[PDB]
C-alpha cells in the first residue's frame, strides 16, 4: 500500500505563475513492466478527474504544455508556468503500479490576494425557533482572507467549547476572500440560563482578536 | 467519444441496499475492465475495485471486501456498483473508470459520478428563522 | 454604514435549497453557507449587507426554495426591538 503525499494542502498563486505541486511515495513506484505509473488528475468543482500527465512526465492528449510531470522513484514534481483563470481546482497523484492504486492527498490550486480582515456580526436566536425551543445564536465571520481564522463562543465570560457547528465558503468567486459562519445551538433552557453572548474573531491581520456579543 | 455515463442521486438510508449503473460508449465494452472509485464528501479519492468484463471476475480493494460488489449487462455494455447493509460512511460520490490497454493502470475515461446519501431522514422541508441584527 | 441580516435555514432533507434575498434583485453582498448535518438533517445559513439607511426603510426579506418539498417559504426581517 503506497500512501502518496502531496505538497502543499493549499497552493495559492497569482495568475500568470509558475505552481510547483510535488507527490511522495512510500515505495518506489515502477512496476513491473518497467515504468513508474505516476499519474495527476485535475477535479473541479463537482467534477471527475481529468488526468493531466501520465508515466511521470507524459502530458495527455490535449492538456497544455504547461503541465509539466517531472520525477524519479519516489519523488515526482508536476509544474504549471503560466497559471490560467482554469487551473484551480484540486490536483492529485496517482499510481497504477502497485495494488491497491493509491490517490494523493490533494493541493488545492486557488488565487491569492492581499489579506484582510473580517465583517464579524452577531445574531441571537429568533422569536419562532425560541418558542420550538432551540436556540441558535449565529456568527458570520464574512470576506476574511486567508482562510485560516478562528472563532470562540463564549457564554457569560466562559468559552463555550461545545454546541457549535461551523461552515466554510470557498474561495469567494467575485473577490478571492474566504467567509465562514459559526453557529451555537443551546435548547431554549440552556439559552435562557445565560446573559452574555461573544464571538472572537481571531484572523492573522490582528493581535487583539475581533469581538461583538449580546446580552437578553 | 468514449463516454462512460452514469446514474443519478440516490437518497438511501442504513440498511437499504443500492445498485448502481456506468454505461459504457463507443468501445469494445468487454476488451477493458471497469473500475470503480469512491470520493467521500469533500476529497476522500479512494478506489473500490474492478470487475474483469470478460469474465465478471471482480477484484476488491482490502476495505470494499464486505457490501459491495460488481455486476454487468453484456446485452447494454452496463457495469454495476452495488452496496448492501447500506452504512452512514457509504455517503460519497462513486466514479467509474477505465484504461487504454496500458497493462500498468491509466485511469483515463471517468464518468460523471453518481453520489449516493445515506440518513435516516425521511424528507423533510427547513424550518425558517430570520437572523436580524440583534447586538 | 453596512447592516447584514441573515437566515437560519434548518431541519431540512434532502438538498438543495435556494436562498435568495429580495426576490433575487439582492445578488451583493450575499453569501449562502455550505449545508451540514446537525445530526442527521441539513442546516445552512445566508447572508446579505445591505446599506444602512434602505434596510429599515423596507423591503428585504429572505428566499429559500426546497426542490423536494416542493416548498417555497421566505421570511422579510423585522428589528424585533425589544
Known amino acids: 500500500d503506497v500512501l502518496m503525499t502531496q505538497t502543499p494542502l493549499y497552493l495559492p498563486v497569482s495568475l500568470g505563475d509558475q505552481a510547483s505541486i510535488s507527490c511522495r511515495s512510500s515505495?518506489?513506484?515502477?512496476?513491473?513492466?518497467?515504468?513508474?505509473?505516476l499519474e495527476w488528475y485535475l477535479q473541479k468543482p463537482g467534477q471527475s478527474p481529468q488526468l493531466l500527465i501520465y508515466?511521470?512526465?507524459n502530458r495527455f492528449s490535449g492538456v497544455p504544455d504547461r503541465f509539466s510531470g517531472s520525477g524519479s522513484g519516489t519523488d515526482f514534481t508536476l509544474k504549471i508556468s503560466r497559471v490560467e483563470a482554469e487551473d484551480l481546482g484540486i490536483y492529485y497523484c496517482?499510481?497504477?503500479?502497485?495494488?491497491?492504486?493509491?490517490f494523493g492527498g490533494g493541493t488545492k490550486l486557488e488565487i491569492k490576494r492581499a489579506d484582510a480582515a473580517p465583517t464579524v456580526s452577531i445574531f441571537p436566536p429568533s422569536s419562532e425557533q425560541l418558542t420550538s425551543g432551540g436556540a441558535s445564536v449565529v456568527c458570520f465571520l464574512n470576506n476574511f482572507y486567508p482562510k485560516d481564522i478562528n472563532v470562540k463562543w463564549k457564554i457569560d465570560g466562559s468559552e463555550r467549547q461545545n454546541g457549535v457547528l461551523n461552515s466554510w465558503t470557498d474561495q469567494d468567486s467575485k473577490d478571492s476572500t474566504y467567509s465562514m459562519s459559526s453557529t451555537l445551538t443551546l435548547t431554549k433552557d440552556e439559552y435562557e440560563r445565560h446573559n452574555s453572548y461573544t464571538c472572537e474573531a481571531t484572523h492573522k491581520t490582528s493581535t487583539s482578536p475581533i469581538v461583538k456579543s449580546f446580552n437578553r | 467519444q468514449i463516454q462512460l455515463q452514469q446514474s443519478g442521486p440516490e437518497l438511501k438510508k442504513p440498511g437499504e441496499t443500492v445498485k448502481i449503473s456506468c454505461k459504457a460508449t463507443?468501445?469494445?465494452?468487454?476488451?477493458?475492465?471497469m473500475h470503480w472509485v469512491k470520493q467521500a464528501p469533500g476529497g476522500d479519492l479512494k478506489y473500490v475495485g474492478w470487475?474483469?468484463?470478460?469474465?465478471?471476475?471482480?477484484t476488491f480493494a482490502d476495505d470494499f471486501k464486505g457490501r459491495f460488489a460488481f455486476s454487468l449487462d453484456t446485452s447494454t455494455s452496463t457495469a454495476f456498483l452495488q452496496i448492501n447493509n447500506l452504512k452512514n460512511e457509504d455517503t460519497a460520490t462513486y466514479f467509474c473508470?477505465?484504461?487504454?490497454?496500458?497493462?500498468?493502470?491509466?485511469?483515463?475515461?471517468w464518468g460523471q459520478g453518481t453520489t449516493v446519501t445515506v440518513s435516516s431522514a425521511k424528507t423533510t422541508p427547513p424550518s425558517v428563522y430570520p437572523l436580524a441584527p440583534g447586538s | 454604514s453596512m447592516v447584514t441580516l441573515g437566515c437560519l435555514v434548518k431541519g431540512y432533507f434532502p438538498e438543495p435549497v435556494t436562498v435568495t434575498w429580495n426576490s433575487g434583485s439582492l445578488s451583493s453582498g450575499v453569501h449562502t453557507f455550505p449545508a451540514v448535518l446537525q445530526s442527521d438533517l441539513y442546516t445552512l445559513s445566508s447572508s446579505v449587507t445591505v446599506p444602512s439607511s434602505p434596510r429599515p426603510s423596507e423591503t428585504v426579506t429572505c428566499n429559500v426554495a426546497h426542490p423536494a418539498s416542493s416548498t417555497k417559504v421566505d421570511k422579510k426581517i423585522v428589528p424585533r426591538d425589544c
Open positions: 473508470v477505465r484504461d487504454r490497454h496500458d497493462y500498468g493502470e491509466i485511469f483515463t475515461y
Open positions: 463507443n468501445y469494445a465494452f468487454t476488451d477493458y475492465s
Open positions: 470487475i474483469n468484463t470478460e469474465t465478471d471476475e471482480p
Open positions: 515505495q518506489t513506484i515502477v512496476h513491473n513492466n518497467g515504468n513508474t505509473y
Open positions: 508515466k511521470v512526465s
Open positions: 496517482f499510481q497504477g503500479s502497485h495494488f491497491p492504486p493509491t
